[PDB]
Symmetry: C2
Amino acid sequence: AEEFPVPNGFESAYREVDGVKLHYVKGGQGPLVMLVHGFGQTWYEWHQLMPELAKRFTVIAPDLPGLGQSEPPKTGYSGEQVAVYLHKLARQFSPDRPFDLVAHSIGIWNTYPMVVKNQADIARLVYMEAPIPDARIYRFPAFTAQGESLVWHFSFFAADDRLAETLIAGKERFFLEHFIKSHASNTEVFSERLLDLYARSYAKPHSLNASFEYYRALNESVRQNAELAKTRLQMPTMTLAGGGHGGMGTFQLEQMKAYAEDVEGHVLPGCGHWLPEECAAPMNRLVIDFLSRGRHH
Amino acid sequence: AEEFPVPNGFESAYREVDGVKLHYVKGGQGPLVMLVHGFGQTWYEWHQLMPELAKRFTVIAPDLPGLGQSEPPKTGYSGEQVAVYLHKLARQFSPDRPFDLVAHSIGIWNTYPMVVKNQADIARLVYMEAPIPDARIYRFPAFTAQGESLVWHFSFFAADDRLAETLIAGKERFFLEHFIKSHASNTEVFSERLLDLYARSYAKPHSLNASFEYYRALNESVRQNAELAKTRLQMPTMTLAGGGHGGMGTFQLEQMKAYAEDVEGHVLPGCGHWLPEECAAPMNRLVIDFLSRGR
């Protein structure tokens, strides 16, 4: 019983990677593009981009370990540990060619280590809407002159005593609606039905826990990344960020400039955090154009 | 009925102030000292200090509007609005003489405006464990290299859509233990029994809502204080802060220096946010000695 509708011409499937059963949706022909979702979401956030990309690329969108229909990681939730699963999953499908990688939100946290450690395996890199975990995240404000800040949820979710799971259980739909909308410019794109689907998925007890375990591991990821970042990324890279309420703005490119030699960035006015949903048309266009300046049947 | 046990020789009473019934506990004789509690607690946080002070002073410990057994404010929850209720209450018992003030946590927010606006009514002042609302609060981090930060709850509590009440309703006892202990160094003083007392009080629906309204008015209080702070405090002031896990550390005194001409500060080692309970002996000593420099 699929959690989300699969686009025509795509298949929902599973692969075991290091003893962990990962779910993914795959379609298209050509060089591989892997699309990695973030918090509060699943592979489905890419469902609009996928059919367009599948015109020129083989497209795979996995569920992060513990989220959607993927099993929890058997190692842990730090960036380096999760990155191994996504890397080996990608290699099962693109053993002989480098693949492209597109990541959003915590998808960035869970891919950066495998990108920096396997540069030859990565053709092109698109990162949108989330800091690479590093010391910069310690600068975001707890509170603003206009109300709640952008990332006070880092503390909420990282807190022990299962704080987040305990408070949110039974209110998963309620919390996710508030969180999505507080980080959105365009809230209308999030129908009652869309919110129901996302809320139902992450409300699975193991998925609600997984959601926050990514955050409880964030400081470890920061420490891991302090070593990894000694090696600059050398592949062509694009960043995207929303310019509206909820978005990262100029931060995305400014940070990436410290990690990547070859990088370009766009800020999308009128869009918040949830680029694939709030600003599907322009986001899709920028991604496709960026990736299509390489190999693609 | 009483939510918390009154110390021997003290009385629990109520006083109507601008149409709001304030609960307070009072005892002792001599010049008035008013002790104002903060978030997650009630007058009861002062119960160990009160008997000692009552040997030299008349001591009054009110419940903040909406919290403990006090009615919610009729005007609003900004510091300037709430401070009126507290000033008028104090002045009923000390109409012809200045009084002393001790405040903790959001008790600071709710007294600063009455202090700066009525400087002659305040003999001596002790503030502990909370920023005066001003632009400095926008500089605290959402997240730290050790985990959850000191004041991320500002955003949580101020969030729209009654986010905090909705998530916390029915889990008040769970949430309060986590909040208190995460902001403590000496966690062992918060026994299950004491936590039960505090949780039962703030679990009253109007109290849970009041708790968060103070944070929802925080930006307004910052705006209010921007004007009020053009005038420095002239009376003797002392700040205390915890030096341990969950404490404000050197921030307390450094900020107060911008507000007061006459200030001395102490950071108490191995104590977090909840000084009256985590570090009763040294905290009580410091307050009693400081206030006893005045007649």
